[PDB]
Every structure is written in structure tokens, then in C-alpha cells.
Amino acid sequence: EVTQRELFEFVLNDPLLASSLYINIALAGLSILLFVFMTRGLDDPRAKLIAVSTILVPVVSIASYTGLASGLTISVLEMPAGHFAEGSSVMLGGEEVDGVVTMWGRYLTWALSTPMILLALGLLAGSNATKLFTAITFDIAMCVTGLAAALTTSSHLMRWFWYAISCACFIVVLYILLVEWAQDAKAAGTADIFSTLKLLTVVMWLGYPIVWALGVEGVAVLPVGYTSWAYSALDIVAKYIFAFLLLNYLTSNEGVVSG
Amino acid sequence: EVTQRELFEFVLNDPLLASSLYINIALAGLSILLFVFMTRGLDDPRAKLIAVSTILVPVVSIASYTGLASGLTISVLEMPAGHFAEGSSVMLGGEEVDGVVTMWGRYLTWALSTPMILLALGLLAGSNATKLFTAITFDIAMCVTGLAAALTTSSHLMRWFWYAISCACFIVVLYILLVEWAQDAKAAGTADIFSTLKLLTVVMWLGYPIVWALGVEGVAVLPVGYTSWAYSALDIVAKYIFAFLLLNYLTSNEGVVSG
Amino acid sequence: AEVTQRELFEFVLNDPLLASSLYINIALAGLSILLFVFMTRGLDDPRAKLIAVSTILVPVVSIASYTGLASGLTISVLEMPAGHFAEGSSVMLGGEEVDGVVTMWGRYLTWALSTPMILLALGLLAGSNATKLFTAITFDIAMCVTGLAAALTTSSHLMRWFWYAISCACFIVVLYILLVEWAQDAKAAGTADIFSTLKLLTVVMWLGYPIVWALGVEGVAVLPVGYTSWAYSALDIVAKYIFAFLLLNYLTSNEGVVSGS
Numbered sequence: 001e002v003t004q005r006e007l008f009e010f011v012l013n014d015p016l017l018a019s020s021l022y023i024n025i026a027l028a029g030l031s032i033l034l035f036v037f038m039t040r041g042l043d044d045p046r047a048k049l050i051a052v053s054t055i056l057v058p059v060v061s062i063a064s065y066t067g068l069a070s071g072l073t074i075s076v077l078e079m080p081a082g083h084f085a086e087g088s089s090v091m092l093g094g095e096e097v098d099g100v101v102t103m104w105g106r107y108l109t110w111a112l113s114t115p116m117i118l119l120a121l122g123l124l125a126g127s128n129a130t131k132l133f134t135a136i137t138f139d140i141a142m143c144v145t146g147l148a149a150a151l152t153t154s155s156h157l158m159r160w161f162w163y164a165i166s167c168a169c170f171i172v173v174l175y176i177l178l179v180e181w182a183q184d185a186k187a188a189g190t191a192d193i194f195s196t197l198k199l200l201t202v203v204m205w206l207g208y209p210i211v212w213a214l215g216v217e218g219v220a221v222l223p224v225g226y227t228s229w230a231y232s233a234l235d236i237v238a239k240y241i242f243a244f245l246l247l248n249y250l251t252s253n254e255g256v257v258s259g
Numbered sequence: 260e261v262t263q264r265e266l267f268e269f270v271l272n273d274p275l276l277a278s279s280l281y282i283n284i285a286l287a288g289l290s291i292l293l294f295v296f297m298t299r300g301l302d303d304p305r306a307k308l309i310a311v312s313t314i315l316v317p318v319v320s321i322a323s324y325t326g327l328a329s330g331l332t333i334s335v336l337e338m339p340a341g342h343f344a345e346g347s348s349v350m351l352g353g354e355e356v357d358g359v360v361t362m363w364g365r366y367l368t369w370a371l372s373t374p375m376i377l378l379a380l381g382l383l384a385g386s387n388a389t390k391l392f393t394a395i396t397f398d399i400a401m402c403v404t405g406l407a408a409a410l411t412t413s414s415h416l417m418r419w420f421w422y423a424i425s426c427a428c429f430i431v432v433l434y435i436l437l438v439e440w441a442q443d444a445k446a447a448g449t450a451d452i453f454s455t456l457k458l459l460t461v462v463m464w465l466g467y468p469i470v471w472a473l474g475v476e477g478v479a480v481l482p483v484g485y486t487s488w489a490y491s492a493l494d495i496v497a498k499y500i501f502a503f504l505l506l507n508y509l510t511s512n513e514g515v516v517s518g
Numbered sequence: 519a520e521v522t523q524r525e526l527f528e529f530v531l532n533d534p535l536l537a538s539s540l541y542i543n544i545a546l547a548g549l550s551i552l553l554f555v556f557m558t559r560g561l562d563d564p565r566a567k568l569i570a571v572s573t574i575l576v577p578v579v580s581i582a583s584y585t586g587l588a589s590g591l592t593i594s595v596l597e598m599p600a601g602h603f604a605e606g607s608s609v610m611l612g613g614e615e616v617d618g619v620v621t622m623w624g625r626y627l628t629w630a631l632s633t634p635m636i637l638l639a640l641g642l643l644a645g646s647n648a649t650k651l652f653t654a655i656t657f658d659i660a661m662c663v664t665g666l667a668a669a670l671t672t673s674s675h676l677m678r679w680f681w682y683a684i685s686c687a688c689f690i691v692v693l694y695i696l697l698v699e700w701a702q703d704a705k706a707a708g709t710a711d712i713f714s715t716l717k718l719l720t721v722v723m724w725l726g727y728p729i730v731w732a733l734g735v736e737g738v739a740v741l742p743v744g745y746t747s748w749a750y751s752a753l754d755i756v757a758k759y760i761f762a763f764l765l766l767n768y769l770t771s772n773e774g775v776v777s778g779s
């Protein structure tokens with residue numbers, strides 16, 4: 001089987017791939033330090049709950065990229081019969097191996113970082129427990145079935161079937177984000193910053209299943225190095241600037257979020 | 260090294276095993292649709308919290324059966340010396356490999372579904388946080404040790420030690436169902452419906468450890484084909500028919516569970 | 519998958535040190551559960567009982583953890599990266615010599631489950647709000663998970679220590695809540711004396727873990743697998759079993775102080 005050090009060497013040796021992971025390790029790390037410094041003045045527990053939940057997003061992110069760049073959460077899988085990338089090979093150093101580079105480390109950690117994005121947003125919008133629970137549970141289900149899709153190599157049909165279940169879970173999250181929380185925000189007095197984050201979230205999040213479908217996991221029209229940067233670019237907005245904006249607001253409106 | 264492709268095909272060529280899986284994938288999916296249209300009328304956040312966790316049971320189920328049917332969450336493990344299934348073979352294709360067919364995928368997802376059934380029941384009985392936390396934590400411990408039980412291939416005795424630990428956690432759950440929530444349901448005003456679901460749950464759940472003990476995992480007096488159906492049958496009652504009854508009540512008494 | 523669970527199971531056995539460090543705690547943990555259940559029988563206030571159940575779950579996670587290690591289910595033989603002081607080591611498993619080191623990752627995996635429980639009890643005992651409980655618990659979990667990643671990384675020596683550093687960062691957050699935040703909250707909750715004792719006990723023992731990790735095979739390798747295992751089992755006996763014994767001992771004589779809601 002392929003070795004962890006080999007995937008690690010495969011990431012290096014490939015500038016596109018290496019830069020998409022190592023840059024976000026630095027960016028997530030700097031984001032954490034920046035965010036902690038920005039909220040060192042909060043005093044209200046609810047505002048502080050929102051801040052910590054937000055800060056956890058890049059915390060999980062930095063561990064995710066370290067797991068990917070270290071080769072710990074990457075594997076070489078062979079696609080099933082009729083998969084647009086079946087018969088492909090990867091080549092580690094001087095050897096060649098059948099399969100595609102499957103970076104499942106992303107799908108796995110999303111199940112931990114996205115619930116946190118949703119938690120901060122829901123709270124910021126004055127959501128009640130029932131909606132938080134719904135958004136979060138289905139969001140986690142979306143991430144897990146997506147991971148399952150990437151890890152399934154027995155059938156091409158199964159892969160897209162998992163993908164469909166994940167899409168169904170995704171619409172549930174979309175519904176509360178666009179319909180439910182958009183209304184709550186007004187009642188909480190945060191409609192302004194929410195609108196911004198909601199639009200940002202929805203637009204960025206929609207990009208993930210597109211990239212998945214266009215990359216080696218899907219119809220393989222994009223290389224692993226390209227698909228990886230697309231995700232990394234999405235992360236920079238959906239996580240880092242998204243967190244900067246929320247915490248920039250939060251620190252200037254601690255009283256309104258206090259309740 | 261057995262490939263996922265082989266286990267998938269192995270599920271075929273064996274109508275008994277295959278049917279028990281694909282049939283529940285459809286019953287789960289259908290159940291979800293029904294439940295969504297049944298709870299369309301609810302407007303009480305507490306009533307909707309109960310319905311969402313109830314709906315999450317079949318949602319986790321479709322995913323579990325898909326993982327199993329696809330071969331993702333199935334493995335062939337050689338049982339330890341002295342084990343009644345030790346020395347068996349499976350033969351995936353034209354070749355024959357030592358071991359048994361372990362469907363650990365079921366034990367894994369229970370740690371996600373069972374907690375949802377319990378959340379529903381606990382909320383119905385007007386349980387307090389302490390009793391909810393107790394049932395859910397010990398319930399998860401029950402599932403995970405069962406999974407550990409099934410994956411232990413080093414010692415026959417260790418497998419059974421796991422089994423015991425799992426049974427001990429099980430009694431904790433049974434004790435809050437039969438004794439604790441039974442009393443709480445009175446103050447809530449749902450002793451009626453609770454008594455029904457409560458009696459249903461306990462009897463069905465009580466059957467899982469028995470199937471495990473009889474199947475290839477335990478004494479091996481039952482073929483994987485029958486053992487699989489036993490669980491499938493049990494799920495249909497412990498999950499789908501159970502969810503329907505709870506949701507049916509809920510939709511007719513939203514004012515009762517409200518608050 | 520050359521190294522089978524069986525070989526690992528038998529490697530533990532036939533190695534008195536290692537075996538004893540695992541089996542002794544399967545017994546100590548089990549006896550602890552019984553003792554704690556027995557001790558808490560007379561509790562009635564739901565909040566007091568939350569603290570008790572949270573505390574009791576600690577030895578529950580522990581008995582399962584040790585079973586996973588002794589059974590060989592959560593142990594693996596891994597080859598250390600170039601530069602690691604243990605690179606080029608052999609374990610001699612079964613009737614063959616195997617490259618690598620015996621990595622007991624099962625300990626790290628379960629800490630993510632038991633430590634959050636130690637923290638819930640303490641936090642509750644200190645009369646903590648939800649924000650601090652949530653912060654303490656998520657960073658505690660992050661600490662455990664990144665510690666597990668550190669021991670599971672075999673590609674690069676620098677990556678291993680980088681995971682370790684991230685994990686340490688998570689650790690200071692837990693240490694700051696315990697030493698700064700809850701220390702003050704306990705004064706308001708009327709549990710100052712007992713929290714401070716348990717605060718110190720917890721802080722002192724928890725510092726032992728990253729030290730053992732650094733000194734043992736996963737780290738600079740001055741401690742062979744058998745001795746790093748016993749060090750952790752020794753730490754667990756104090757940080758889990760006796761820590762819980764002392765907390766439950768106080769709780770059962772002061773149910774009213776923590777009664778609240």
C-alpha cells in the first residue's frame with residue numbers, strides 16, 4: 001500500500017498542491033492569533049460563546065490542513081468500473097501506482113468545522129434550539145455522506161448515490177439559512193451582518209459540491225492540484241474572512257448580541 | 260487484501276443478504292418522505308425538536324444500509340482460536356479467503372441512531388437534562404463497545420468481555436426507560452403514548468444482543484443471511500414503525516408536548 | 519496488515535511490564551465504577567446527579583480504553599520518520615522481528631472521551647456558565663485529537679512535533695480556564711476549597727502526560743514502550759480513579775451545596 005511519507009512527498013514536489021495546503025496552515029494559524037487578539041475585550045458570555053465557536057473554525061482548519069499536508073489524511077484509491085478516472089495512476093517518486101489522490105481529510109474535518117460555522121451564525125441570528133439542532137445535525141450528515149461517497153470504490157453508482165443523500169441534507173441547511181435564520185436575524189437586531197454572512201456562506205458553500213463533481217472524485221475534469229486550490233480558496237472566504245467579518249462586527253456590537 | 264468491490268458483489272450472489280439490505284434502504288427513504296409530510300403541520304419549536312430527532316433515525320438508517328450494501332462498512336475478519344466460527348472461509352469471487360463476513364457497519368451507525376430515538380422519547384416524557392445525558396452517554400458506550408466486540412479478533416474471551424461491558428451499559432438505558440421516564444411521562448401528560456413506545460423500544464432493542472450472540476459474531480448458529488434479516492426486521496419496528504407511531508401522536512397532540 | 523491483532527495481544531502478554539500496566543487498570547477502573555455507583559446511591563438533586571454521572575463515566579471510558587489496548591485492538595506498529603530518535607527500532611512480534619515501534623494510540627483516542635467528562639464535572643462543581651464549559655471541552659477535545667494525530671504521523675519528524683505544539687496550545691486554554699476562570703467561579707458557587715484541591719490535582723497530573731509523551735517512544739524515546747505505558751497508567755490512577763473518588767466523596771456529603779438547578 002502507499003505510505004504516509006510518500007503522500008507527504010507527493011504533496012511537496014508538486015508546487016500547486018503544496019501551496020494550497022501549506023498556505024492555509026499559515027493563514028489559519030495567523031487567523032487564530034488575530035481572532036484571539038481581536039476579541040480579548042469581550043465580557044458578555046453569549047458574545048463570547050459566539051466568538052469561541054467562530055475561533056474554533058480556523059482551529060479545526062489548521063489541524064485539517066496539517067493532516068492533509070502530512071499525508072495522514074490522504075489516500076490513493078482506485079475508482080470503480082465506468083468512473084471517469086478509472087485506469088488513472090499517480091506515481092510516487094520513482095514508482096507508479098493505480099488510483100487517484102483522495103484527500104478525504106477535508107470531508108472528515110468539515111463535519112467538525114462547519115457545525116461551528118453554523119453554531120456562530122445561528123446564535124448571531126437569535127436562532128432557537130430546534131433550528132440550531134436541525135441545521136447542525138443535517139450539516140454533519142451532509143459531511144459524513146460526502147466522505148462516504150469519496151471512500152466508496154465498489155460502484156460508480158453508489159458514489160453518486162451517496163452524493164445525492166448529501167445534497168438532500170445540504171438543502172435542509174440551506175433552507176434554515178435562507179428562510180428561517182433570515183427572519184430571526186431581524187428580530188435579534190442583526191439582519192445587517194447576517195445578510196452579509198448568509199450570502200457569503202451560501203455562495204461559498206455551494207462551491208464545494210461543484211468542485212467535488214468536477215474533480216477526480218467526480219467527472220475528473222479538474223486535476224488534483226486545481227481542485228485542491230479551489231477548496232483552499234473557498235476555505236479562505238467561507239472560514240477566514242467569514243470569521244474576520246463576524247468577529248469584527250461582534251466586537252463593535254457586543255451589546256446587541258448580548259441579548 | 261479483500262477489495263470493497265468484492266464485498267459489494269458478495270452481497271449479491273446471496274439473495275438473503277442482499278434483500279435485507281436494499282429493502283431497508285427503500286423503507287428508510289420512504290419512511291423519511293412520509294414523516295416529512297406528516298409533520299408539515301407542526302409549529303411548536305418543542306414539538307418540532309421531537310419530530311426532527313425522530314426523523315433523523317431513518318436518515319441515519321438509509322446511510323447505514325447504503326454503507327453496508329456498498330461494502331464500505333463491511334469486512335472479513337478471522338475469528339480467534341476457540342471461536343465457533345474460527346476456521347471459516349467466505350470466497351468472494353473464484354478464490355476463497357479465510358474469515359467471516361463482519362457487518363460492523365451496523366454497530367457503528369447505531370451510536371448515531373439510537374441516541375436520536377432516545378432523545379425523542381426523553382423529550383416526550385418531559386425528561387430533565389440529567390436523565391437525557393445519562394441515557395445517551397451510556398447508550399453510545401453500549402454501541403461502541405459492541406462495535407469493539409465485533410472487531411476484536413485477538414481473543415475469544417476478549418470479545419465476550421466487550422459484550423458484557425456493552426450489556427452493562429444497556430441496563431442503564433433500560434432502567435431510565437422502564438423506571439425513570441415512565442414516571443416523568445406522567446407529569447408531562449404523555450404516559451399513554453409513552454407506555455406504547457416504551458414497551459415497543461425495550462422489546463425490540465432487547466433482541467439485538469440475542470441476534471449478535473446467535474449469529475456468526477457469537478456462537479454462529481445462524482447464517483449471516485438470517486442474522487442480517489433479524490436486525491433488518493428489528494429496525495423496521497424499532498425505527499420506522501416506531502417513528503410513525505410517535506409522529507402520529509405528536510401531530511395530533513402538539514399542544515401536549517409544547518412548552 | 520502483516521502485524522495481526524493476535525500478535526499484538528500476545529506481545530502485550532509475555533511482557534510483564536506492559537501487560538501489568540494494562541490489565542491492572544482494567545480491574546482498577548471496574549472496581550472504581552462499582553465503588554462510585556455504590557457511593558452515589560443516595561443522591562437526589564438532578565444537578566448533583568449530573569456531576570456524579572459525569573464523574574462515573576470517566577472510569578467507564580477507561581475500562582473500555584484499557585480493554586482496547588490489552589486486546590490489541592487499539593495498538594499498532596509504526597515506523598518512525600527519519601530524524602526520530604526511535605527510527606530503525608524493531609519490536610520482534612510473534613516469531614519475527616518487525617521494524618517500527620509499538621504505538622498505543624488507543625490511549626489518545628479515548629482521552630478525547632474521558633477528559634471532557636472530568637472537565638464537565640469540575641466545571642459544574644465550580645458553578646461555571648455554559649460559555650466556559652463549552653470552551654474548556656472543545657479545546658480539551660482538540661488537544662486529544664491533535665495528540666493522536668501526532669502519534670499517528672509517520673511521514674515527517676517535524677510534523678509530529680508540530681501536531682504536539684498545536685495540542686499544547688489547546689492545552690493552555692484548558693489550563694487557563696481551570697486556573698483562572700473556574701478558580702474564581704468556585705468562590706461564588708461556594709465550592710472554593712474542594713475545587714481548588716481538585717484543580718491543583720488535575721493540573722499537576724495533566725502536566726505529566728505531555729511530559730511522558732515527550733520522554734517516551736513517541737517522543738525522544740528515552741522511555742521504552744513498557745515504561746511509557748506504566749507512566750500513563752500511573753497518571754490515570756490519580757487523574758481519573760482517585761480524582762473521581764475524592765470528588766464523589768465531597769459531593770455525597772454536600773449534595774445541597776451543588777443542588778442548584
Ligand SMILES: *C/C=C(C)/C=C/C=C(C)/C=C/C1=C(C)CCCC1(C)C
Pocket residue numbers: 107110113114117142143145146147149162163166167170205206208209212235238239
Ligand atoms: C470549511 C469548510 C466548508 C464551509 C465546507 C463546506 C462543504 C460543503 C457545503 C460540502 C458539500 C457536499 C455536497 C452537498 C455533496 C457531496 C459532496 C460534498 C461533501 C462536497
Ligand SMILES: *C/C=C(C)/C=C/C=C(C)/C=C/C1=C(C)CCCC1(C)C
Pocket residue numbers: 366369372373401402404405406408421422423425426429464465467468469471494497498
Ligand atoms: C436502530 C437500532 C437499534 C434500536 C439498535 C439497538 C442495539 C442494541 C440494543 C445493541 C446491543 C448489544 C449488546 C447489549 C451486547 C453486545 C452486542 C450488541 C452490540 C448487539
Ligand SMILES: *C/C=C(C)/C=C/C=C(C)/C=C/C1=C(C)CCCC1(C)C
Pocket residue numbers: 626629632633661662664665666668681682683685686689724725727728729731754757758
Ligand atoms: C484520563 C486521561 C487524562 C487526564 C489525559 C490527559 C492528557 C493530556 C493533558 C495530554 C496532553 C498532550 C499535549 C498537551 C501535547 C501532545 C501530546 C498529549 C496528547 C500527551
Ligand SMILES: [Br-]
Pocket residue numbers: 043044045048647649650
Ligand atoms: Br464567559
Ligand SMILES: [Br-]
Pocket residue numbers: 060061064106109110113
Ligand atoms: Br476543516
Ligand SMILES: [Br-]
Pocket residue numbers: 128130131303304307
Ligand atoms: Br422551530
Ligand SMILES: [Br-]
Pocket residue numbers: 319320323365368369372
Ligand atoms: Br442505524
Ligand SMILES: [Br-]
Pocket residue numbers: 387389390562563564567
Ligand atoms: Br435526575
Ligand SMILES: [Br-]
Pocket residue numbers: 579580583625628629632
Ligand atoms: Br481513557
